Design a protein around this ligand. Structure first.
Ligand SMILES: O=C1NCC[C@@H](O[C@@H]2OC[C@@H](O)[C@H](O)[C@H]2O)[C@@H]1O
Length: 312
């Protein structure tokens, strides 16, 4: 194996990255995207704010570019994300009751339909739970619609796209904890009542030297509920600047994650949230933290690269 792509290919799994369409005009970026991955997800192009800036007015330009890139290079296409509390336009946050419900169902239907046949799987609902257990405490959907909005989104997504793999996504649920437990209950419930649900996405936004020791176990119990599992937004945050020691630990961590997936027959694969640290979303969100991706700002393979290659 000379690329992470064929390594993942040989393991019968996916290895993807979060794409910023604008960067495709950057040669080195495209070269890596083209050769090191077999799956692609829109880092931002398919979110609510990007697809429905104004009520009932859709903007699929950016999303279509991402979709075209996938079809053009023969990569699987992953959809992110239909229902999410973040990056939600104000016009939506201003709606309530029936109006809001209607706008949510409409958003799901229009976006799902638009990419039908192209997007193979969707993070239908993202980040619905709260660290420590229970539902997220700062979500427009949870506050305006209560517990039933999740099921409604999945049913509406299934209605718009009969065959797409419908997933629920979250972070800090990689290991067994109060958050993953609540997520687990929801999944068990949905499968029990026949609610459309086919997968669970573990964002996996981890911190170096802090990969959950029960990652595999946790992935396995979810898979045993009768749904596929996948690492969808992998990146391992470290205190900057980076140094040999922290880069080595990070490498060991990436190995652990990919290995956990490899040890679960239902783990479809791993998707890293970006290619290079030059564009990683971490620094601006986590002050003093960064250097979380496989390639550095100069597009040089970091120790994590060889670790992933080995894990696969
Ligand atoms: O599921 C998610 N978990 C947190 C990272 C977020 O992506 C982030 O959203 C904010 C954007 O400014 C940023 O470019 C993007 O990387 C993602 O959609």
């Amino acid at each position: 194996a000379t690329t992470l792509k064929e390594a993942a290919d040989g393991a019968g799994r996916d290895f993807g990255f979060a794409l910023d369409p604008n960067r495709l005009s950057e040669a080195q970026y495209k070269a890596i995207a083209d050769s090191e991955f077999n799956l692609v997800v829109a880092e931002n192009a398919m979110k609510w704010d990007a697809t429905e800036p104004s009520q009932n007015s859709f903007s699929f330009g950016a999303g279509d570019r991402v979709a075209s890139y996938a079809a053009d290079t023969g990569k699987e296409l992953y959809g992110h994300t239909l229902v999410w509390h973040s990056q939600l336009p104000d016009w939506a946050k201003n709606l309530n009751g029936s109006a809001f419900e209607s706008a949510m169902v409409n958003h799901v239907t229009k976006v799902a339909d638009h990419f039908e046949g192209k997007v193979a799987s969707w993070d239908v609902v993202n980040e619905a739970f709260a660290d420590g257990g229970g539902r997220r405490q700062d979500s427009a959907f949870q506050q305006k619609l209560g517990n039933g909005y999740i099921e409604t989104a999945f049913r509406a997504a299934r209605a718009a796209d009969p065959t797409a793999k419908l997933c629920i996504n979250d972070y800090n649920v990689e290991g067994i904890n109060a958050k993953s437990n609540s997520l687990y209950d929801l999944v068990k419930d949905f499968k029990a009542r026949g609610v459309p649900l086919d997968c669970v996405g573990f964002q996996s936004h981890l911190i170096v030297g802090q990969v959950p020791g029960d990652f595999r176990q946790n992935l396995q119990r979810f898979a045993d509920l009768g749904v596929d599992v996948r690492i969808t937004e992998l990146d391992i945050r470290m205190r900057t600047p980076s140094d040999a020691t922290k880069l080595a630990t990070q490498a060991a961590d990436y190995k652990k994650v990919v290995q956990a997936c490899m040890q679960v027959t239902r783990c479809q694969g791993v998707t890293v949230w970006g290619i290079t640290d030059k564009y990683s979303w971490v620094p601006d969100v986590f002050p003093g933290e960064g250097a979380a991706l496989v390639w550095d700002a100069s597009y040089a393979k970091k120790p994590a690269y060889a670790a992933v290659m080995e894990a696969f």
